[PDB]
DNA sequence: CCACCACGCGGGCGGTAGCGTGCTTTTTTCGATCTTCC
DNA sequence: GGAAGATCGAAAAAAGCACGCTACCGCCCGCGTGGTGG
RNA sequence: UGGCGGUAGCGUGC
Protein backbone atom coordinates (compact mmCIF):
# COMPACT_ATOMS: atom_id res chain seq x y z
CA UNK A 1 0.00 0.00 0.00
CA UNK A 2 2.84 2.41 0.79
CA UNK A 3 4.38 1.69 -2.61
CA UNK A 4 0.97 2.27 -4.19
CA UNK A 5 0.68 5.69 -2.53
CA UNK A 6 4.33 6.50 -3.28
CA UNK A 7 4.55 8.95 -6.22
CA UNK A 8 8.25 8.40 -6.86
CA UNK A 9 9.42 5.54 -9.06
CA UNK A 10 13.23 5.86 -9.11
CA UNK A 11 16.16 6.71 -6.86
CA UNK A 12 16.66 10.15 -8.41
CA UNK A 13 13.00 11.11 -7.93
CA UNK A 14 13.07 9.95 -4.30
CA UNK A 15 16.27 11.93 -3.67
CA UNK A 16 14.74 15.04 -5.25
CA UNK A 17 11.61 14.65 -3.10
CA UNK A 18 13.71 14.21 0.05
CA UNK A 19 15.77 17.30 -0.78
CA UNK A 20 12.62 19.32 -1.45
CA UNK A 21 11.12 18.25 1.88
CA UNK A 22 14.33 18.93 3.81
CA UNK A 23 15.32 22.22 2.13
CA UNK A 24 12.31 23.94 0.54
CA UNK A 25 12.96 26.82 -1.83
CA UNK A 26 16.42 25.85 -3.02
CA UNK A 27 16.47 24.41 -6.56
CA UNK A 28 16.80 20.63 -6.28
CA UNK A 29 19.56 18.91 -8.22
CA UNK A 30 21.25 15.52 -8.34
CA UNK A 31 24.52 16.55 -6.69
CA UNK A 32 23.05 18.55 -3.80
CA UNK A 33 20.34 15.98 -3.05
CA UNK A 34 22.83 13.10 -3.15
CA UNK A 35 25.27 14.93 -0.88
CA UNK A 36 22.53 15.85 1.60
CA UNK A 37 21.21 12.28 1.73
CA UNK A 38 24.69 10.80 2.19
CA UNK A 39 25.60 13.30 4.92
CA UNK A 40 22.26 13.08 6.75
CA UNK A 41 22.64 9.56 8.16
CA UNK A 42 25.90 8.16 6.73
CA UNK A 43 28.53 10.79 7.64
CA UNK A 44 30.61 10.61 10.81
CA UNK A 45 30.40 14.41 11.20
CA UNK A 46 26.68 15.18 10.92
CA UNK A 47 25.47 11.84 12.34
CA UNK A 48 27.00 10.06 15.33
CA UNK A 49 25.33 7.20 17.18
CA UNK A 50 27.03 6.86 20.55
CA UNK B 1 6.44 58.96 25.04
CA UNK B 2 10.00 58.43 26.29
CA UNK B 3 9.03 57.78 29.91
CA UNK B 4 6.91 54.81 28.87
CA UNK B 5 10.16 53.40 27.42
CA UNK B 6 12.70 54.72 29.93
CA UNK B 7 16.47 54.32 29.79
CA UNK B 8 17.49 52.87 33.16
CA UNK B 9 20.79 54.40 34.38
CA UNK B 10 23.09 51.51 35.28
CA UNK B 11 26.31 51.50 37.28
CA UNK B 12 29.51 52.10 35.34
CA UNK B 13 27.89 54.41 32.78
CA UNK B 14 25.97 51.73 30.87
CA UNK B 15 22.30 52.25 30.03
CA UNK B 16 19.60 49.58 30.03
CA UNK B 17 17.75 49.79 26.70
CA UNK B 18 14.19 48.48 26.46
CA UNK B 19 13.10 46.34 23.52
CA UNK B 20 10.82 49.13 22.28
CA UNK B 21 13.81 51.44 21.81
CA UNK B 22 15.64 48.75 19.82
CA UNK B 23 12.62 48.12 17.59
CA UNK B 24 12.12 51.85 17.01
CA UNK B 25 15.81 52.22 16.14
CA UNK B 26 15.57 49.33 13.67
CA UNK B 27 12.48 50.84 12.03
CA UNK B 28 14.11 54.28 11.80
CA UNK B 29 17.30 52.84 10.29
CA UNK B 30 15.34 50.81 7.73
CA UNK B 31 13.23 53.82 6.77
CA UNK B 32 16.31 56.02 6.36
CA UNK B 33 18.03 53.36 4.25
CA UNK B 34 14.94 53.02 2.05
CA UNK B 35 14.75 56.80 1.59
CA UNK B 36 18.45 57.00 0.72
CA UNK B 37 18.18 54.17 -1.81
CA UNK B 38 15.06 55.73 -3.36
CA UNK B 39 16.99 58.99 -3.73
CA UNK B 40 19.81 57.10 -5.48
CA UNK B 41 17.35 55.55 -7.98
CA UNK B 42 18.19 51.94 -7.17
CA UNK B 43 16.95 49.14 -9.46
CA UNK B 44 13.54 47.60 -8.91
CA UNK B 45 14.70 44.51 -7.02
CA UNK B 46 16.80 46.46 -4.51
CA UNK B 47 14.04 48.93 -3.65
CA UNK B 48 11.49 46.10 -3.49
CA UNK C 1 22.88 28.37 -18.18
CA UNK C 2 24.68 30.82 -15.90
CA UNK C 3 22.26 33.15 -14.14
CA UNK C 4 22.38 36.30 -12.02
CA UNK C 5 21.34 36.56 -8.37
CA UNK C 6 21.43 39.31 -5.75
CA UNK C 7 22.56 38.73 -2.16
CA UNK C 8 22.81 40.80 1.01
CA UNK C 9 26.23 40.84 2.67
CA UNK C 10 27.20 41.28 6.31
CA UNK C 11 28.18 44.65 7.76
CA UNK C 12 31.64 45.69 6.59
CA UNK C 13 32.38 42.30 5.01
CA UNK C 14 31.90 42.97 1.29
CA UNK C 15 35.60 42.50 0.48
CA UNK C 16 35.90 39.21 2.38
CA UNK C 17 32.74 37.80 0.79
CA UNK C 18 33.90 38.93 -2.65
CA UNK C 19 37.30 37.26 -2.17
CA UNK C 20 35.71 34.02 -0.97
CA UNK C 21 33.26 34.02 -3.90
CA UNK C 22 36.05 34.66 -6.41
CA UNK C 23 37.85 31.73 -4.81
CA UNK C 24 34.70 29.66 -5.42
CA UNK C 25 34.74 30.77 -9.09
CA UNK C 26 31.53 32.82 -9.25
CA UNK C 27 31.32 36.13 -11.10
CA UNK C 28 30.96 39.09 -8.73
CA UNK C 29 29.55 42.56 -9.37
CA UNK C 30 29.19 45.52 -7.01
CA UNK C 31 28.66 49.19 -7.96
CA UNK C 32 31.44 51.46 -6.72
CA UNK C 33 31.13 55.18 -5.95
CA UNK C 34 34.30 57.28 -5.78
CA UNK C 35 32.98 60.87 -5.80
CA UNK C 36 31.56 60.68 -2.28
CA UNK C 37 32.26 63.11 0.56
CA UNK C 38 31.95 62.49 4.31
CA UNK C 39 32.86 64.42 7.45
CA UNK C 40 35.67 61.91 8.09
CA UNK C 41 37.90 63.42 5.40
CA UNK C 42 41.37 62.05 4.59
CA UNK C 43 41.09 62.37 0.80
CA UNK C 44 37.34 61.87 0.63
CA UNK C 45 37.70 60.88 -3.04
CA UNK C 46 37.90 57.12 -2.47
CA UNK C 47 35.99 54.12 -3.80
CA UNK C 48 32.90 53.22 -1.76
CA UNK C 49 30.20 50.60 -2.42
CA UNK C 50 27.15 52.08 -4.10
CA UNK C 51 23.96 50.33 -3.00
CA UNK C 52 25.69 49.12 0.18
CA UNK C 53 25.43 45.51 1.36
CA UNK C 54 24.22 44.31 -2.06
CA UNK C 55 26.26 42.01 -4.30
CA UNK C 56 25.34 40.49 -7.67
CA UNK C 57 26.60 36.97 -8.41
CA UNK C 58 26.64 35.25 -11.80
CA UNK C 59 26.84 31.45 -11.60
CA UNK C 60 25.15 28.23 -12.65
CA UNK C 61 23.30 26.50 -9.78
CA UNK C 62 24.22 23.07 -11.16
CA UNK C 63 27.96 23.79 -10.96
CA UNK C 64 27.74 25.37 -7.49
CA UNK C 65 24.65 25.12 -5.29
CA UNK C 66 22.90 28.12 -3.78
CA UNK C 67 23.50 26.79 -0.25
CA UNK C 68 27.26 27.09 -0.83
CA UNK C 69 26.77 30.72 -1.88
CA UNK C 70 24.59 31.30 1.19
CA UNK C 71 27.45 30.32 3.54
CA UNK C 72 30.59 31.77 1.95
CA UNK C 73 32.27 33.59 4.86
CA UNK C 74 30.63 36.99 4.61
CA UNK C 75 27.40 36.55 2.63
CA UNK C 76 24.62 37.42 5.08
CA UNK C 77 21.78 35.91 3.03
CA UNK C 78 20.10 35.75 -0.37
CA UNK C 79 17.46 38.16 -1.67
CA UNK C 80 14.40 35.89 -1.62
CA UNK C 81 11.05 37.07 -3.01
CA UNK C 82 9.31 33.95 -1.78
CA UNK C 83 10.70 30.47 -1.26
CA UNK C 84 13.15 30.50 -4.18
CA UNK C 85 15.98 33.04 -4.56
CA UNK C 86 15.21 35.95 -6.86
CA UNK C 87 16.80 36.03 -10.32
CA UNK C 88 17.46 39.49 -11.76
CA UNK C 89 17.06 39.93 -15.53
CA UNK C 90 20.21 40.28 -17.61
CA UNK C 91 18.97 43.70 -18.77
CA UNK C 92 19.28 45.07 -15.22
CA UNK C 93 22.86 43.81 -14.93
CA UNK C 94 23.77 45.19 -18.36
CA UNK C 95 22.32 48.58 -17.40
CA UNK C 96 24.10 48.62 -14.03
CA UNK C 97 27.39 47.77 -15.76
CA UNK C 98 27.53 51.23 -17.39
CA UNK C 99 24.87 53.05 -15.35
CA UNK C 100 27.20 54.60 -12.76
CA UNK C 101 28.04 58.25 -13.58
CA UNK C 102 29.26 58.99 -10.01
CA UNK C 103 26.66 60.68 -7.79
CA UNK C 104 27.18 64.13 -6.29
CA UNK C 105 24.65 63.87 -3.45
CA UNK C 106 26.14 62.50 -0.24
CA UNK C 107 24.74 61.88 3.26
CA UNK C 108 27.35 64.28 4.70
CA UNK C 109 28.10 67.53 2.87
CA UNK C 110 31.45 69.24 3.62
CA UNK C 111 30.98 71.48 0.56
CA UNK C 112 31.34 75.25 1.02
CA UNK C 113 28.16 77.25 1.48
CA UNK C 114 26.30 74.47 3.31
CA UNK C 115 24.69 75.40 6.62
CA UNK C 116 26.10 73.46 9.57
CA UNK C 117 24.69 73.25 13.10
CA UNK C 118 26.88 73.88 16.15
CA UNK C 119 26.12 71.93 19.33
CA UNK C 120 28.81 73.27 21.69
CA UNK C 121 29.44 76.57 23.44
CA UNK C 122 27.34 79.69 22.98
CA UNK C 123 26.92 78.69 19.32
CA UNK C 124 24.89 75.61 20.29
CA UNK C 125 21.61 75.56 18.39
CA UNK C 126 22.87 77.91 15.66
CA UNK C 127 23.70 77.41 11.99
CA UNK C 128 26.89 78.63 10.32
CA UNK C 129 28.06 78.78 6.71
CA UNK C 130 30.86 76.50 5.49
CA UNK C 131 34.03 78.22 4.27
CA UNK C 132 35.99 75.51 2.41
CA UNK C 133 37.49 72.04 3.05
CA UNK C 134 40.95 72.73 4.49
CA UNK C 135 42.88 69.84 5.98
CA UNK C 136 42.00 66.15 6.08
CA UNK C 137 41.20 65.28 9.70
CA UNK C 138 39.08 68.42 10.19
CA UNK C 139 37.38 71.25 8.30
CA UNK C 140 36.97 74.96 9.04
CA UNK C 141 33.60 76.62 9.63
CA UNK C 142 32.48 80.25 9.34
CA UNK C 143 31.16 81.14 12.79
CA UNK C 144 28.35 83.71 12.82
CA UNK C 145 28.45 86.54 15.32
CA UNK C 146 25.64 89.08 15.14
CA UNK C 147 28.13 91.70 13.93
CA UNK C 148 29.65 89.61 11.13
CA UNK C 149 30.72 86.10 10.13
CA UNK C 150 34.35 85.01 10.49
CA UNK C 151 36.05 81.74 9.51
CA UNK C 152 37.86 79.50 11.99
CA UNK C 153 39.17 75.93 12.02
CA UNK C 154 37.10 73.38 13.95
CA UNK C 155 37.23 69.64 14.50
CA UNK C 156 35.31 67.54 11.98
CA UNK C 157 33.25 65.90 14.73
CA UNK C 158 32.78 69.21 16.59
CA UNK C 159 30.16 70.46 14.11
CA UNK C 160 27.02 68.59 13.05
CA UNK C 161 25.38 68.39 9.64
CA UNK C 162 22.17 70.41 9.41
C1' DC D 1 54.37 49.15 12.91
C1' DC D 2 51.24 47.14 16.61
C1' DA D 3 47.90 47.45 20.51
C1' DC D 4 44.35 49.81 23.50
C1' DC D 5 40.30 53.21 23.63
C1' DA D 6 36.26 55.67 21.75
C1' DC D 7 32.29 56.11 18.32
C1' DG D 8 28.76 55.16 15.05
C1' DC D 9 25.52 51.98 12.38
C1' DG D 10 23.19 47.49 11.38
C1' DG D 11 20.18 42.83 12.87
C1' DG D 12 20.10 34.83 13.08
C1' DC D 13 24.48 32.78 13.93
C1' DG D 14 27.75 31.18 11.77
C1' DG D 15 29.11 28.96 8.18
C1' DT D 16 32.22 27.47 2.49
C1' DA D 17 25.02 23.91 6.79
C1' DG D 18 22.18 23.19 9.66
C1' DC D 19 19.82 24.18 14.10
C1' DG D 20 13.94 21.02 15.95
C1' DT D 21 12.31 16.55 18.27
C1' DG D 22 7.67 14.47 26.01
C1' DC D 23 0.38 19.14 25.32
C1' DT D 24 -4.38 20.23 24.77
C1' DT D 25 -8.18 22.65 22.78
C1' DT D 26 -10.18 25.52 19.25
C1' DT D 27 -10.27 27.62 14.68
C1' DT D 28 -9.09 27.81 9.76
C1' DT D 29 -7.95 25.86 5.34
C1' DC D 30 -7.20 22.54 1.75
C1' DG D 31 -6.83 18.38 -1.21
C1' DA D 32 -9.50 14.85 -2.24
C1' DT D 33 -13.49 12.74 -3.00
C1' DC D 34 -18.27 13.06 -4.06
C1' DT D 35 -22.22 13.89 -5.52
C1' DT D 36 -25.56 15.99 -7.49
C1' DC D 37 -27.15 18.13 -10.68
C1' DC D 38 -29.11 20.94 -15.82
C1' DG E 1 -21.19 14.37 -18.67
C1' DG E 2 -18.39 18.15 -16.93
C1' DA E 3 -18.85 21.97 -13.36
C1' DA E 4 -20.32 23.82 -8.81
C1' DG E 5 -21.76 23.10 -4.06
C1' DA E 6 -20.94 19.54 0.01
C1' DT E 7 -18.26 17.66 2.99
C1' DC E 8 -14.94 15.43 5.22
C1' DG E 9 -11.21 14.24 7.32
C1' DA E 10 -6.59 15.55 7.68
C1' DA E 11 -3.26 18.96 8.52
C1' DA E 12 -1.62 23.54 10.03
C1' DA E 13 -1.85 27.66 13.04
C1' DA E 14 -3.05 30.22 17.42
C1' DA E 15 -3.64 30.57 22.51
C1' DG E 16 -3.44 28.85 27.38
C1' DC E 17 -1.42 26.67 30.98
C1' DA E 18 -3.54 29.30 39.94
C1' DC E 19 -2.16 32.89 43.63
C1' DG E 20 1.02 35.44 46.93
C1' DC E 21 6.33 35.47 48.74
C1' DT E 22 11.89 34.52 49.41
C1' DA E 23 17.04 33.78 47.94
C1' DC E 24 21.04 33.32 44.42
C1' DC E 25 23.28 33.65 39.66
C1' DG E 26 23.77 35.85 34.65
C1' DC E 27 22.63 39.91 31.52
C1' DC E 28 21.00 44.75 30.19
C1' DC E 29 24.51 44.96 21.75
C1' DG E 30 28.67 44.71 19.49
C1' DC E 31 31.73 44.90 16.10
C1' DG E 32 34.16 47.24 12.61
C1' DT E 33 36.66 51.54 12.22
C1' DG E 34 39.13 55.56 13.21
C1' DG E 35 42.34 57.99 16.97
C1' DT E 36 46.17 57.83 19.39
C1' DG E 37 49.96 56.36 21.93
C1' DG E 38 54.30 53.58 22.66
C1' U F 1 17.28 50.38 45.35
C1' G F 2 15.33 49.45 37.91
C1' G F 3 14.05 45.42 35.23
C1' C F 4 14.30 40.35 32.22
C1' G F 5 15.95 34.89 31.96
C1' G F 6 17.46 30.61 34.69
C1' U F 7 17.65 27.88 39.36
C1' A F 8 15.92 26.47 44.15
C1' G F 9 12.57 26.98 48.15
C1' C F 10 7.86 28.46 51.24
C1' G F 11 2.21 28.29 52.18
C1' U F 12 -1.84 25.79 49.75
C1' G F 13 -7.56 18.35 52.80
C1' C F 14 -5.55 17.47 56.85
Swiss-Prot record, chain A:
Application notes: Co-administration of salinamide and rifampicin or salinamide and myxopyronin suppresses the emergence of resistance to both antibiotics.
Highest taxon listed in the record's lineage: Bacteria
Modified how: Acetylated on several lysine residues in the presence of glucose.
Coiled-coil portions: none
Self-association state and partner proteins as the record states: The RNAP catalytic core consists of 2 alpha, 1 beta, 1 beta' and 1 omega subunit. When a sigma factor is associated with the core the holoenzyme is formed, which can initiate transcription. The rRNA transcription and antitermination complex (rrnTAC) consists of RNAP, NusA, NusB, NusE (rpsJ), NusG, SubB, ribosomal protein S4, DNA and precursor rRNA; S4 is more flexible than other subunits. In pull-down experiments interacts with CedA. (Microbial infection) Interacts (via flap domain) with Escherichia phage lambda antitermination protein Q; this interaction renders bacterial RNAP resistant to transcription pausing and allows it to read through termination signals.
Family note: Belongs to the RNA polymerase beta chain family.
Known function: DNA-dependent RNA polymerase (RNAP) catalyzes the transcription of DNA into RNA using the four ribonucleoside triphosphates as substrates. Resistance to the antibiotics salinamide A, salinamide B, rifampicin, streptolydigin, CBR703, myxopyronin, and lipiarmycin can result from mutations in this protein.
Name listed for the protein in its UniProt record: DNA-directed RNA polymerase subunit beta
Protein's organism: Escherichia coli (strain K12)
Lineage, broadest ranks: Bacteria, Pseudomonadati, Pseudomonadota, Gammaproteobacteria, Enterobacterales
Gene name per UniProt: rpoB
Span within the parent record: 349 to 398 of 1342
Swiss-Prot record, chain B:
Mod. after translation: Acetylated on several lysine residues in the presence of glucose.
Disulfide bonds: none
TM segment ranges: none
Reported uses of this protein in biotechnology and industry: Co-administration of salinamide and rifampicin or salinamide and myxopyronin suppresses the emergence of resistance to both antibiotics.
The family this protein is said to belong to: Belongs to the RNA polymerase beta' chain family.
Subunit annotation: The RNAP catalytic core consists of 2 alpha, 1 beta, 1 beta' and 1 omega subunit. When a sigma factor is associated with the core the holoenzyme is formed, which can initiate transcription. The rRNA transcription and antitermination complex (rrnTAC) consists of RNAP, NusA, NusB, NusE (rpsJ), NusG, SubB, ribosomal protein S4, DNA and precursor rRNA; S4 is more flexible than other subunits.
Role this protein plays: DNA-dependent RNA polymerase (RNAP) catalyzes the transcription of DNA into RNA using the four ribonucleoside triphosphates as substrates.
Protein name: DNA-directed RNA polymerase subunit beta'
Organism of derivation: Escherichia coli (strain K12)
Encoding gene (name): rpoC
Part of the full-length chain shown: 246 to 293 of 1407
Curated annotation (Swiss-Prot), chain C:
Stored NCBIfam families: PRK09014.1, RfaH
Protein name: Transcription antitermination protein RfaH
GO cellular component labels: cytosol
SMART domains reported in the protein's UniProt record: NGN
Subunit structure as annotated in this protein's UniProt entry: Interacts with both the nontemplate DNA and the RNA polymerase (RNAP). Monomer in solution.
Gene3D superfamilies on file: NusG, N-terminal domain
Keyword DNA-binding: yes
Sample GO molecular function, one term: transcription antitermination factor activity, DNA binding
Any one Pfam family match given in the protein's UniProt record, by short name: NusG
Function: Enhances distal genes transcription elongation in a specialized subset of operons that encode extracytoplasmic components. RfaH is recruited into a multi-component RNA polymerase complex by the ops element, which is a short conserved DNA sequence located downstream of the main promoter of these operons. Once bound, RfaH suppresses pausing and inhibits Rho-dependent and intrinsic termination at a subset of sites. Termination signals are bypassed, which allows complete synthesis of long RNA chains.
Keywords for the protein's UniProt record, in alphabetical order: DNA-binding, Transcription, Transcription antitermination, Transcription regulation
Domain of life: Bacteria
InterPro entries documented for this protein: NGN-like_dom, NGN_dom_sf, NusG-like, Transcription_antiterm_RfaH
Family (UniProt): Belongs to the RfaH family.
Domain text: The N-terminal domain contains a vast hydrophobic cavity that is buried by the C-terminal domain. This cavity may bind the RNAP and become unmasked only upon binding to the nontemplate DNA strand.
Knockout-associated phenotype: Inactivation results in increased initial adhesion and biofilm formation.
CDD domains, alphabetized: NGN_SP_RfaH (cd09892)
GO biological process, one term: transcription antitermination
Amino acid sequence: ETLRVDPTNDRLSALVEIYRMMRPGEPPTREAAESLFENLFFSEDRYDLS
Amino acid sequence: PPDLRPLVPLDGGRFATSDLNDLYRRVINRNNRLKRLLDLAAPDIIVR
Amino acid sequence: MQSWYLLYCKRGQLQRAQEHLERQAVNCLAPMITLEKIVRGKRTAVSEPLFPNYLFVEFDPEVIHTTTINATRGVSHFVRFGASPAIVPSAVIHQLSVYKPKDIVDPATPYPGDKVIITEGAFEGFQAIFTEPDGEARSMLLLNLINKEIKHSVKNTEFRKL
